[PDB]
Amino acid sequence: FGGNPGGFGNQGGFGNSRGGGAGLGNNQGSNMGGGMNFGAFSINPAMMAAAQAALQSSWGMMGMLASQQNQSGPSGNNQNQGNMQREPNQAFGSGNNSYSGSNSGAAIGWGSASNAGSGSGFNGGFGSSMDSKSSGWGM
Amino acid sequence: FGGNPGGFGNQGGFGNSRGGGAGLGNNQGSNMGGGMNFGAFSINPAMMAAAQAALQSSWGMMGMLASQQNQSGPSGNNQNQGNMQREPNQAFGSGNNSYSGSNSGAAIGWGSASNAGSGSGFNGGFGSSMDSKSSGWGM
Amino acid sequence: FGGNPGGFGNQGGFGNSRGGGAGLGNNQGSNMGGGMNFGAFSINPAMMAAAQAALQSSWGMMGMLASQQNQSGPSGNNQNQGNMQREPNQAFGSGNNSYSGSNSGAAIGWGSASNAGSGSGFNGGFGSSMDSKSSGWGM
Amino acid sequence: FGGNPGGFGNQGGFGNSRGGGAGLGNNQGSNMGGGMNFGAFSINPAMMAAAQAALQSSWGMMGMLASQQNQSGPSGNNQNQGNMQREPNQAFGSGNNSYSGSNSGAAIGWGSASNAGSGSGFNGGFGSSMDSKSSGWGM
Amino acid sequence: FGGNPGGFGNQGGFGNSRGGGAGLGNNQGSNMGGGMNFGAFSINPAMMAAAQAALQSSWGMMGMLASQQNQSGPSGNNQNQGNMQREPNQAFGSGNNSYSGSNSGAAIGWGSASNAGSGSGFNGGFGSSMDSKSSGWGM
């Protein structure tokens, strides 16, 4: 009860980005300021893949092909024009004006995580916690 | 109950980015300021891959192909024009005006994590924590 | 119950970026200021890969192909035109106006992490923590 | 229950960036100021790889191919035109106007980490912490 | 239960960047100011690699191919036009106007780390901490 996954045959091209002819015959790329300018993209990762346990794997692409996952923090105004306090005492948290913003990215793939906490608490912990045990052929 | 994953045959090209003809025949690249300018991209990572335990692997691309995951901090105004305090005492946290911003990137892939905390707390911990145990052929 | 993953045959080209013809026949690259200017890119990492335990591996590309993950800190104004305090005492945290910004990059790949804390707390810890145990053929 | 991963055959070219013909026949590269100007890129790292435990490895590229992960600190204005204090006492943290910015890069690959703290706290620790134990054929 | 990963055959070229013909036939490189100007790049690190435990290794490229990971510190203005203090006492931290910026690079590869702290705290520690134990054939 084992396996033998294989037996593949191709006869034509394979991932051959043959850019021919007059196409692409004149590139005029200009950049200014920050940012980037490009000319063209031909991405053809053809592949021939075999395995006997494709476990939690990815065989094409994973993350982000054309995506604007851009992040911006607070833009408003925090005005604090007076807080008459006479005498606090042992005040662990008091009188705290907090204008806070928090952003996290897309959690893509196995066992990912995006945690975003904002405000005036969150004591007693934060963040991810992962215990991974991966064994090929093993316990 | 083992395995023998293989037996692959190709006859044509393989990942051969043969850029021929008049195409690409005139590149005019200009840059100014920061940032980058490029001419063209032909990326054809064709491949022939075999394994017997493709466990938590990636065989094509993973992260980011064309992506604007750019991050900007606070842009607003924090005005603090007075806080009449007479006498605090043992004030661990008091009177704290905090204009805070926090951003994190995309967590892509296995067991990644993006934690973003912002504000006036978060004592008693922060951040990720990972215990990985990977064993090929082993326990 | 072992293995023998192999048996690959190719007959054509293999990752041969044969840039021929009139294409690319005239490059005019100009740069100014900071930043970079390039001419063209032909990246064809074709490969022939075999293994018996592809565990948490990557066999193509991983990180960032064309990406603007650029980061900017605070841009707003922090105005503090008065805080009448008569007598604090043992004030561990008090009267703190804090305009803070924090950014982190994309956490790509296995067991990565991007932590971003900003504000007026975060005592008692920060940052990642990883205990890795990898054993080939071993416990 | 061992292994023998191999048996690869190629007949054509292999990673041979044969740039022929009139293409590339006239390069005019100019630079000014800082920054860089280049002419063209033909990167074809074709390879023939075998192993018996590809554990947490990378066999193509890893980090950053074309990426603007550039970082900028604070750009706003911190105005502090008065803080009438009569008598603090044992004030560990008080009266602190702090305009702070913090950026971190992309954490790419296994067990990486990007920590970015900014503000008015973070006592009692910071930064990463890693305990790695890797054993080939061993415990 | 050992191994014998091998058996590779090539017949054509191998990483031979044969730049022939009229292409590249006229280079005109000019530089001014700082920075660099180049002519062209043909990078074809073809390779034939075998192993029996490719553990936490990299076999192609790792770090940065074309990347603007450039860093800039603060650019804003820190104005401090008065702080009427009569008598502080034992003031470990007080009256501190701090305009601070901190940047870190991309943490690429195994067990890397980029820590960036900025502000008015961070006592009681900072920075990375790593305990590595690598043993070939050993405990």
Resolution in A: 3.2
The DSSP result for chain D, as a single string, is: -------EE--S--S-----SSTT--EEEE--SSSEE---EEE---EEEE-S-EES-BSS--S-SEE---EE---S-EEE----BS---S-SSBS--EEEEEE---EESTT--EEEEEES--TT--S--EEEEEEES--
Give burial (CB, 10 Å; 0-12/13-18/19+) of C107.
Answer: buried
Sign of the CA dihedral running A19, A21, A23, A29: positive
Beta carbons within 8 Å of B11's beta carbon, 6+ residues apart = A10, A11, A12, C11, C12
Reading the block at residue D26, the tokens are 């006239």
- Using CA coordinates, name the residue in chain B closest to D16: B16
Instruction: For residues A98 and A82, give the distance between their C-alpha atoms in angstroms, rounded to a whole number.
Output: 14
* Experimental method, per PDB record: cryo-EM
From the list B14, B36, B63, the residue facing D68 with the nearest CB is: B36
Give, in order, the Cα–Cα distances in Å from E66 to each of B39, B126, C35, C128, D64.
13, 34, 11, 28, 7
B96-110 per-residue burial string, b: 16 or more CB within 10 A, e: under 16: bbbbbbbbbbbbbbb
Interchain pair E12, D16: CB under 8 A = yes
Cβ-based burial of D2 (10 A; exposed 0-12, middle 13-18, buried ≥19):
middle
Q: Which of B65, B72, B84 to mutate to test the interface with A (most CBs of A within 10 A)?
A: B65
- The closest alpha carbon to B6, from D7, A45, C53, belongs to D7
Which residues does chain B have within 8 Å of residue D132's beta carbon, measured at their own beta carbons?
Answer: none
Checking DSSP bridges between strand A71-72 and strand A54-55, what pairing results, if any?
Answer: unpaired
Q: Considering just the CA atoms, what is the radius of gyration of chain E in Å?
A: 27
* Tokens linked to D63: 């980090």
Q: Which residue of A has its CA nearest to B66?
A: A66
Nearest Cα neighbor of B14 from A92, C8, D96 is C8
Nearest CA in chain B to D139: B138
Q: Identify whether the C-beta of residue B137 lies closer than 8 Å to the C-beta of residue A115.
A: no
Q: In the numeric block, which tokens belong to residue B116?
A: 């973003």
Residues of E in contact with C94 (CB under 8 A): none
| Residues 46-75 in D contacting C (C-alpha not used; CB under 8 Å) | 46-75
Distance from CA of B96 to the nearest CA of A (A): 5
The rounded distance, in Å, linking the Cα atoms of E69 and E55 is: 29
Tokens of A109: 């793939």
